């Protein structure tokens, strides 16, 4: 249902908010 | 800078991910 | 069920990640 | 320095939290 739907939304934005730490740490890093 | 850039970057997705889990706990609580 | 206990869990985990991150950006900006 | 410390403990509280989501999503898949 619904909120299964706003579930696989909110996996989605923490893989994003993943990437986006992984490409600072870099940064750092780098 | 390069770094000053990045930290820009990794302030923005913070924010978006915020948002993503306000949605979230807004779908959670509805 | 087990679940509704689990959201609390993160809900707290969510509540402190935002706090280590505002944290992190007094630091970057002091 | 002091910058460097601060980009530690943010770094741990990223792991806290993706631990946190990892037994989050269990919870929810189980």
């Known amino acids: ?3 299964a739907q ?3 939304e ?3 934005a923490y893989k994003e908010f ?3 730490y992984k490409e ?3 940064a ?3």
């Open 6 to 8: 706003a579930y696989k």
């Open 18 to 20: 993943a990437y986006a």
């Open 1 to 3: 249902g619904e909120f």
């Open 10 to 12: 909110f996996a989605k």
């Open 24 to 26: 600072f740490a870099q």
């Open 28 to 30: 750092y890093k780098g």
